[PDB]
């Protein structure tokens, strides 16, 4: 019950995850604590270095392991490249985000996956007590820089209403398709 800011983490610095992290670093003015995950710590250091040199409005924090990313963040957002990387980061690893999810966390997956992966992700997140949204993004990294991305969010509607101010920082056309798996 401590009055504090929202801990928001971005997992995966790739083709699309880096402009998402830059939009969350620029357009959030002292309203969130930003966490940046990568497999190599030098890539997260480079992303935070560019965000601090260009001038960001929030404080940022690098991560190398998924356990610290799970125990620190209230909101986790994954923007990865392959379905294998997202399935490893969410389900297959020992320190994975959904299998070790705390009560009340919200995990949004922007990586385009299959239907059964998102089904098992939402089912095990609801079993752990957390919330899972699947929101596959449509657009270029230049369109992500301009804040214009297409999001099709599947999951809870109240969780969608909570996550709309974060979704509007990097995506323009954000639709709520319904239950989990529709996006």
């Amino acid at each position: 019950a401590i009055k504090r800011s929202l801990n928001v983490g971005v997992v995966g610095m790739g083709n699309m995850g880096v402009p998402i992290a830059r939009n969350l670093g620029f357009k959030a003015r002292s309203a969130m604590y930003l966490q940046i995950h990568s497999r190599a710590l030098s890539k997260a250091k480079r992303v935070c270095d560019d965000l601090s040199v260009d001038g960001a409005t929030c404080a940022m924090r690098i991560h190398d392991r998924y356990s610290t990313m799970t125990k620190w963040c209230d909101v986790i957002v994954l923007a990865l490249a392959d379905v294998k990387a997202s399935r490893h980061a969410l389900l297959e690893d020992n320190e994975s985000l959904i299998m070790n999810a705390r009560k009340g966390q919200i995990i949004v997956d922007h990586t385009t996956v299959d239907a059964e992966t998102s089904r098992e992700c939402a089912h095990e997140a609801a079993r752990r007590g957390a919330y899972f949204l699947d929101a596959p993004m449509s657009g270029s990294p230049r369109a992500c820089f301009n804040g214009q991305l297409l999001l099709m969010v599947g999951g809870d509607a109240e969780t969608f209403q909570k996550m709309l101010p974060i979704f509007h920082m990097y995506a323009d056309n954000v639709f709520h398709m319904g239950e989990s798996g529709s996006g």
Partner: protein, 512 residues
């Protein structure tokens, strides 16, 4: 419907496989032997089984089980049957500590079947997979244990003593006999008279850690309950440590409590405890060049050169603080916590750079002006609204002097330098205090001591009205004041002059 199992040292939490190696011989190990390793419990290691068998069980003997009492009784009987005169009467914790010490002494690294509990490589694997299972607080406690105990011994011991200790670890007779032939190995071993300095070095390091970890929460409680009753200078006087050390203890304790609870830390606290230090020292630094430090902010004359400048300095230091904090009278205008978080958070470098002397506010109130009537009507009502703010400042003979800056920006001056700002919606408003000071030369200093309500007024500083009557201001000899008073008052009476004659209320004929 999932219950997260509680994790501790007895059963370690499962970790990932792509983690970096903590120890140096494991980073260059080939990956086939990395895949050869099996996921076993921590006691399945022979060193871990040894530590659980003879060390951890004796620490578990301190609890209230009956088998612990039987083992304590037979250990007392064993140590009394060794020799009675040395350990005649001591408690159960004493015999537990003694047998723990004696079993820590007799640890050797050989073959597991030759009579020795574990090998050296099993101990290295235990150290590597024990350091891998540590968090940031675990690594912090590991470094604190290094600084408290191992660091003075490394500061005292010679490197040949480190080679002797490594030969004692590896326990190979060939390596020991190859080291024993060297005369420089045998002669350069350290003397205990020099080795006794490690006790004093260890005591000093543990004394600094007792300053941090033991006096720290007491200082934090005394400063966080009533900071106006126990300021940091009062704590620095009553405990005698230092001023900056007490403030660093407070900052470190708050940031340590914030970092260990996964909470974003309050960044305003180093701005509140090191406010003068934040304004003086904290600068933006570029990469490929070196910087300096100003000894003084201004090229001035000294106050020891005259008695009157000396008396002015002593009277100003009387009317000043020594240290100003968030609860004092210059910071009494922060009546809302939103203004508190706005002043101390992310804009303190701008808010302190407004005015050099600390005043009861930060700027000036903004008032707006009236628009002159445009006789073309609504044909030209669109033209004042634009895209940007249009700021206009005055110049002239009377206006634009750096020596008269605080007089030309004085709102109680009738010849004030006129500023105007047209908003993009057409509103004509006055300028803010930083907006008025932006048109002059830069003034990049700050006064963190002098507070003007603390000035002396009863003994020596007594301004008399007869001193102001020595100028002999008269209205009959000079009529500029009456003319400005005539220019100030309205001229509504000029139209109802014919409507001595004095103006009365309108008489009603309907009620009369």
């Amino acid at each position: 419907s999932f219950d997260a199992p509680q994790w501790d040292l007895w059963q370690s939490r499962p970790r990932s496989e792509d983690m970096d190696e903590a120890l140096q011989p494991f980073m260059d190990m080939p990956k086939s032997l990395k895949d050869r390793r099996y996921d076993i419990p921590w006691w399945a290691n022979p060193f871990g089984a040894w530590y659980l068998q003879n060390i951890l069980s004796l620490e578990l003997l301190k609890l209230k089980s009956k088998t612990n009492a039987e083992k304590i009784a037979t250990y007392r009987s064993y140590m009394r049957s060794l020799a009675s005169g040395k350990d005649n009467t001591m408690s159960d914790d004493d015999v537990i500590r003694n047998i723990i010490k004696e079993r820590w002494k007799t640890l050797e690294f050989g073959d597991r079947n030759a009579g020795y509990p574990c090998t050296f490589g099993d101990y290295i694997q235990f150290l590597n997979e024990w350091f891998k299972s540590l968090d940031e607080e675990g690594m912090q406690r590991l470094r604190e244990h290094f600084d408290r105990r191992i660091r003075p011994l490394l500061a005292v011991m010679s490197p040949v003593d480190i080679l002797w200790l490594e030969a004692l670890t590896q326990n190979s007779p060939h390596n020991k006999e190859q080291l024993q032939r060297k005369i420089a190995f045998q002669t350069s071993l350290g003397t205990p008279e020099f080795f006794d300095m490690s006790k004093r070095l260890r005591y000093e390091i543990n004394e600094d850690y007792k300053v941090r970890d033991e006096l720290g929460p007491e200082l934090f409680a005394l400063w966080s309950k009533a900071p106006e009753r126990w300021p940091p200078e009062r704590l620095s006087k009553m405990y005698g440590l230092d001023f900056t050390l007490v403030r660093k203890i407070l900052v470190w304790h708050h940031f340590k409590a914030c970092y260990d609870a996964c909470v974003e830390p309050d960044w305003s606290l180093p701005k509140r405890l090191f406010a003068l230090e934040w304004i003086r020292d904290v600068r933006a630094r570029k990469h490929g060049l070196f910087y300096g430090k100003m000894r003084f902010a201004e090229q001035k004359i000294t106050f020891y050169s005259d008695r009157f400048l000396f008396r002015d300095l002593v009277n100003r230091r009387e009317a000043s603080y020594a240290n100003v904090w968030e609860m004092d009278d210059p910071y009494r205008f922060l009546q809302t916590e939103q203004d508190y978080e706005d002043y101390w958070g992310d804009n303190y470098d701008v808010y302190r750079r407004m005015f050099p002397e600390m005043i009861g506010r930060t700027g000036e109130p903004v008032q707006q002006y009236g628009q002159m009537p445009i006789w073309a009507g609504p044909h030209r009502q669109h033209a004042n609204k634009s895209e940007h703010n249009w700021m206009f400042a005055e110049i002239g003979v009377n206006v634009g002097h750096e020596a008269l800056k605080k007089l030309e920006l004085d709102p109680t001056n009738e010849k004030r330098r006129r500023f105007v700002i047209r908003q993009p919606d057409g509103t004509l408003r006055s300028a803010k205090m930083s907006e008025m000071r932006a048109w002059y030369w830069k003034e990049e200093w700050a006064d963190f001591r002098f507070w003007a309500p603390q000035m002396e007024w009863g003994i020596e500083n007594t301004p008399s009205q007869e001193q102001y009557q020595e100028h002999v201001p008269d209205t009959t000899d000079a009529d500029f004041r009456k003319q400005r008073r005539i220019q100030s008052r309205p001229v509504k009476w000029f139209y109802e002059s014919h409507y001595e004659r004095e103006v009365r209320w309108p008489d009603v004929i309907n009620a009369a």
